[PDB]
Every structure is written in structure tokens, then in C-alpha cells.
């Protein structure tokens, strides 16, 4: 049989890891590959070097039936090597299971590689604090069994169902935070259940690539020379991190733009509650989905250097280009940021807060929210 590798991710963290996997394997120019990465366009110069390389759109967190046409090109026995986003794993593998169903003799699942979406997994697990995890796991395994057998999705506990793929396939999980699993006492039954099927995301993998593969990887994530250089200057550096909002509105986006500009000034103005001192060069790392929110900071702020919003913050870590201090709105990027580089984390009782306090990312101090900082200026 042939092995076909599928890389599916609507978000960004998993994509970063999958792109690394691609890079690590990039010597093989003919291994069938199917990219379903909503946030990363593989440039055409790289595309033209590979054969049997395919692309599928995602819609509603699942590949479209365009996937069937790709797969039909491989008439032999095929084994599926699948990389997914943990939070949306159930939906992302739905059409693959559907296709498998129409082709039992030829199509089988080799294994699954699951990666965290971000803070979302943790916030959702935090909400199961009061439940009997052990009982929840068994229900999940049983319901997953029904899905695999009927194609129908029905989970009493959709959060816990994300973690029971062991019962069906060889799987490896890559967690943003292993600590959460090891330290949260109510999750001890999930931890033991997972046994040897998980590991921490290895942010040092980049260091082990050859220099040409590094240049290659940088092209996939879009970390160009111009950005690299401004982060190599020899001066004290602070990066303000932006956030965004789902709420496809305007009054909310606008409000978020205003508050985030205010939060910036609390960091950068002498009268601010968060004032960092006047010995740092200021940088802005807007949120990749910030849109107008990011424009708003660049249009109204003063002596600040922009790090193109599309570049995922974790790329700076991999390339060793982390600044001295990082501050801004609570974000998935703070789960992997070295502790001594945290200036201050602000939020917009609260499970996101509970998660970060449990992980020690924030202390017992007293959470600062958006709306408690006065309008400076
Ligand atoms: N200011 C920001 C915010 C998020 N991000 C990217 O978006 C991902 C998810 O972030 P949020 O949890 O903040 O939505 C982060 O892991 C990071 O890769 C960024 O690069 N810069």
C-alpha cells in the first residue's frame, strides 16, 4: 500500500507543527501529501518542486468533498497518515471516515497526530473540573465507537471525546501544556489513560534542521529578512501583543481597538499603570486575525516597530529572536513563552484566568482586565 499524509488545520499552532513535519520530510519529493491548512499558503516556488502534492479547502472545520477527488487518484491500497487539530479533530476527520466507509477494502487509517489549537483546549478542559473523568472517558470511547461504525457524531462530552482516539487508532498527541495534564488533579484519570501517547510540542525542532531546511521553513511561515533584521538589533526590546475578537460586529471590534490602544499606552507612557520604563524599543505583534484592530494601533501609536501580524509569534522563539519583555492581552502564545520574558498579561471566576494561574503563567496577584484601566491621554 501507499501512505498518504494529510495535514489538516484551520488554525495556526497545529499548522506550524505540521509544516515542521513537512520540512523534516522535505527530502522525499514524491510522497503523496494533502494540505488543508487554512492559514498557510505554500508558495508556488516550493509547490513546483514536489509531485503528488495536493490542496483541499476547509469549511466548517472539515475538508470539502474535493478531498474525495484527490483520493480517487490513488487506486491502490492506501494508508492514511493524518495530522489534525485536537479541538476540531472529530469534524476534521469526518469526511475521511466517510470516504473510508465507501472503500473498506482499499482505504485504512495508519495513524493520527494531534496538535493543540491553543488556549481553547485548556479552557474547555477546565470546565470539566467537577465531573467524573473516568466515567467520561468510557462514555467518550463508547460514543467514538458508534461514530466509527455509523458515521454519526453524538458525544455527551465533546471535550473529553477529543482525547480518546487511542481506542481506535495509533495516535500521538502534542500538547501546548503537559503541565496542565500533570498538575490538574481532576485530570489525573485522563493523564494515566493517555499513558505514552502524548508529548509536549518541541519548539526546539527548528534548531535541529539543517540551515537550508531552516530557510525553507521560514518561507512556509512567512518570516522574511526584513523582520528578522529588526529583531537582531542590539538593544532592549519589548513586544506588545495584540488580540482579536470573533464577534463579527463593529461596535465590539471598535471597542477592542480602542481598549487595546489604551492598554499599549499603559505600558509605554510614564503615567501608565504598566509602565515599562524608557529603555526599551517598542514592537507591535498584532493578532493574525486582528484586521482593523491592528491598523488601529499602527495608525494611532507613536514610535513603534511593526512585526507583520501574519507571522505567528512562536516563530520568534524557534529562531531565537525573542525580545526581553513581552506584554499584552491573554493569548495562546503566553503558554510557551519563557517565564522571565513576561511583562504583564491583561484579560478582556474566569476559566482562562483559572488555567493561567494553575499553570503558574500568572500568579495569585490580582488579574487586570481591559475595562479597569483608565483612558489615558
Ligand atoms: N498577538 C498575537 C496573538 C496571537 N498570535 C498567534 O495566534 C495564536 C493563537 O492566539 P490567540 O490564542 O491569542 O488567539 C498564537 O499561538 C500565535 O501563534 C500572534 O502571533 N500574535
**Atom 5 of ligand 1, residue of closest alpha carbon:** 287
Return the ligand 1 atom nearest residue 311 CA. 20
Give the sign of the dihedral formed by CA 22, CA 211, CA 316, CA 222.
negative
How far apart (Å, rounded) are the C-alpha atoms in residues 24 and 72?
27
Task: Report the candidate in 168, 178, 62, 170 with the shortest Cα–Cα distance to residue 113.
Answer: 170
User: Which long-range CB contacts under 8 A does 177-184 form with residues at least 24 apart?
Assistant: 177/122, 177/335, 177/359, 179/359, 179/360, 180/122, 180/125, 180/355, 180/358, 180/359, 183/358, 183/359, 184/125, 184/358
Ligand 1 mean position to 336 CA, how many Å? 11
Mutation choice for ligand 1 from 17, 118, 346, CB with most ligand atoms inside 8 A: 118
Please, what is the end-to-end C-alpha distance for the chain in angstroms? 67
Q: How far apart are CA 303 and CA 308, in angstroms?
A: 16
| Pocket of ligand 1 contains residue 313 by CB under 6 Å | yes
Nearest CA to ligand 1 atom 2: 287
Per the CB < 8 A criterion, the answer to whether 176 and 332 are in contact is yes
Method: X-ray
> Are 261 and 296 a contacting pair, CB within 8 Å?
yes
CA distance 181 to 363: 19
CA of 72 to the centre of ligand 1 (A): 36
Q: Does residue 260's CB lie within 6 angstroms of at least one atom of ligand 1?
A: no
User: Is residue 138 within a helix (H) or strand (E), and if so which, with residue range?
Assistant: helix 133-150
Confirm or reject: Cβ of 89 under 6 Å from ligand 1.
no
Contact between 328 and 243 (Cβ < 8 Å): yes
Task: Set out the domains of the chain in order of their start, with CATH numbers.
Answer: 1-209 (3.40.50.11120), 210-373 (3.40.50.11110)
Output the nine-digit C-alpha cell for 229: 533584521
Taking 3-state DSSP, the helix, strand and coil percentages for the chain, each rounded to the nearest 5, stand at 40, 20, 40
Annotated binding site for CMP: 242, 285, 287, 312-314, 331-332
The Cα–Cα gap between 160 and 194 comes to: 12
Task: Determine whether the shortest distance from the Cβ of 119 to ligand 1 is under 6 A.
Answer: yes
Place of cell 488601529: 296
- Is residue 242 within 6 Å of ligand 1 at its C-beta? yes
- What's this structure's resolution in Å? 2.3
Is beta strand 33-37 parallel, antiparallel or unpaired with respect to 2-9? parallel
Of 79, 39, 38, residue with least CA distance to 62: 38
Q: How far is the CA of 189 from the centre of ligand 1 (A)?
A: 30
C-beta 17 within 6 A of ligand 1: no
Q: Give me the helices (H) in 247-309, please.
A: 251-268, 292-300
In ligand 1, which atom is closest to the CA atom of 242?
A: 1
Question: Measured in angstroms, how far is the CA atom of residue 313 from the centroid of ligand 1?
Answer: 6
Instruction: Yes or no: say if 330 and 293 are a contact pair by the CB < 8 Å rule.
Output: no
Name every residue whose Cβ is closer than 8 Å to that of residue 309 and which is 6 or more positions away in sequence: 242, 285, 286, 287, 288, 290, 294
Q: Is 36 in the pocket of ligand 1 (CB under 6 A)?
A: no
Q: What is the CA radius of gyration of the chain?
A: 22
Distance 207 CA to ligand 1 centre (A): 22
**What distance in angstroms lies between residue 335's CA and the mean position of ligand 1's atoms?**
11
Inter-residue contact 4 to 78 (CB < 8 Å)? yes
How many of the other CB atoms lie within 10 Å of CB of 328?
Answer: 25
- C-beta of 312 in contact with ligand 1 (< 6 A): yes
**Chain Cα centroid distance, residue 34:** 19
In sequence order, the 6+-apart residues with CB closer than 8 A to the CB of 10 are: 38, 39, 58, 61, 85, 88, 92
Amino acid at each position: 500500500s501507499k501512505t498518504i499524509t494529510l495535514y489538516l488545520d484551520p488554525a495556526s499552532l497545529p499548522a506550524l507543527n505540521q509544516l515542521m513535519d513537512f520540512t523534516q520530510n522535505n527530502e522525499d519529493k514524491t510522497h503523496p501529501r494533502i494540505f488543508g491548512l487554512s492559514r498557510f499558503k505554500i508558495p508556488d516556488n516550493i509547490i513546483t518542486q514536489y509531485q503528488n502534492i495536493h490542496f483541499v479547502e476547509l469549511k466548517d472545520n472539515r475538508p470539502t468533498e474535493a478531498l474525495f477527488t484527490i483520493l480517487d487518484q490513488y487506486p491502490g491500497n492506501i494508508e492514511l497518515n493524518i495530522h489534525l487539530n485536537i479541538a476540531h479533530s472529530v469534524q476534521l476527520i469526518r469526511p475521511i471516515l466517510a470516504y473510508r466507509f465507501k472503500h473498506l477494502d482499499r482505504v485504512s487509517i495508519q495513524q493520527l497526530n494531534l496538535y493543540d489549537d491553543g488556549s481553547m483546549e485548556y479552557v474547555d478542559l477546565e470546565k470539566e473540573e467537577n465531573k467524573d473523568i473516568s466515567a467520561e472517558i468510557k462514555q467518550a470511547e463508547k460514543q467514538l465507537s458508534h461514530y466509527l461504525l455509523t458515521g454519526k457524531i453524538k458525544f455527551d462530552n465533546p471535550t473529553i471525546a477529543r482525547y480518546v482516539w487511542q481506542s481506535a487508532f495509533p495516535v500521538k498527541y502534542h500538547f501546548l501544556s503537559t503541565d496542565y495534564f500533570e498538575k490538574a488533579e481532576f485530570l489525573q484519570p485522563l493523564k494515566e489513560y493517555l499513558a505514552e501517547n502524548y508529548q509536549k510540542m518541541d519548539w526546539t525542532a527548528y534548531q535541529q534542521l539543517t540551515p537550508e531546511q531552516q530557510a525553507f521553513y521560514l518561507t512556509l511561515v512567512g518570516f522574511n529578512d526584513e523582520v528578522k533584521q529588526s529583531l537582531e538589533v542590539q538593544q532592549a526590546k519589548f513586544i506588545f501583543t495584540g488580540t482579536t475578537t470573533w464577534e463579527g460586529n463593529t461596535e465590539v471590534r471598535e471597542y477592542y481597538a480602542q481598549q487595546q490602544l489604551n492598554l499599549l499606552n499603559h505600558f509605554t507612557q510614564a503615567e501608565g499603570d504598566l509602565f515599562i520604563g524608557d529603555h526599551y524599543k517598542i514592537y507591535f505583534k498584532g493578532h493574525p486575525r486582528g484586521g482593523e484592530i491592528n491598523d488601529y494601533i499602527l495608525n494611532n501609536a507613536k514610535n513603534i516597530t511593526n512585526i507583520p501580524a501574519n507571522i505567528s509569534f512562536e516563530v520568534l522563539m524557534m529562531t531565537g529572536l525573542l525580545p526581553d519583555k513581552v506584554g499584552g492581552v491573554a493569548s495562546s502564545l503566553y503558554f510557551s513563552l519563557p517565564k522571565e520574558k513576561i511583562s504583564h498579561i491583561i484579560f478582556t471566576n474566569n476559566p482562562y484566568v483559572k488555567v493561567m494561574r494553575r499553570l503558574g503563567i500568572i500568579d495569585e496577584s490580582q488579574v487586570i482586565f481591559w475595562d479597569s484601566l483608565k483612558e489615558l491621554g
